[PDB]
Amino acid sequence: LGGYVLGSAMSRPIIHFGSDYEDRYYRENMHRYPNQVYYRPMDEYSNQNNFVHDCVNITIKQHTVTTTTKGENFTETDVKMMERVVEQMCITQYERESQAYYQ
């Protein structure tokens, strides 16, 4: 009941950073980041901020576990990048959950 599930796979959202360097790094590395997020249906009984931050934390940690198994490593830069895009994908997921709930 309190577990996580995966939401639908998403196409690459447009994500803007503060610098040319970051945007270029992001464009060249985004293929390595998640396009589907883990979220907790019970968090819909809590606030939006909690749902999102749980989704960000579990999504990035599970993806790290999956990535490690392929002999690969994420740098601090990669995690910062993933935090940005995964946060937007988690909000999208929430908004889709909300739309369904009220529709």
Curated annotation (Swiss-Prot):
<feature type="glycosylation site" description="N-linked (GlcNAc...) asparagine">
    <location>
        <position position="57"/>
    </location>
</feature>
<comment type="similarity">
    <text>Belongs to the prion family.</text>
</comment>
<feature type="glycosylation site" description="N-linked (GlcNAc...) asparagine">
    <location>
        <position position="73"/>
    </location>
</feature>
<comment type="subunit">
    <text>Monomer and homodimer. Has a tendency to aggregate into amyloid fibrils containing a cross-beta spine, formed by a steric zipper of superposed beta-strands. Soluble oligomers may represent an intermediate stage on the path to fibril formation. Copper binding may promote oligomerization. Interacts with GRB2, APP, ERI3/PRNPIP and SYN1. Mislocalized cytosolically exposed PrP interacts with MGRN1; this interaction alters MGRN1 subcellular location and causes lysosomal enlargement. Interacts with KIAA1191. Interacts with ADGRG6.</text>
</comment>
<comment type="function">
    <text>Its primary physiological function is unclear. May play a role in neuronal development and synaptic plasticity. May be required for neuronal myelin sheath maintenance. May promote myelin homeostasis through acting as an agonist for ADGRG6 receptor. May play a role in iron uptake and iron homeostasis. Soluble oligomers are toxic to cultured neuroblastoma cells and induce apoptosis (in vitro). Association with GPC1 (via its heparan sulfate chains) targets PRNP to lipid rafts. Also provides Cu(2+) or Zn(2+) for the ascorbate-mediated GPC1 deaminase degradation of its heparan sulfate side chains.</text>
</comment>
<feature type="disulfide bond">
    <location>
        <begin position="55"/>
        <end position="90"/>
    </location>
</feature>
<protein>
    <recommendedName>
        <fullName>Major prion protein</fullName>
    </recommendedName>
</protein>
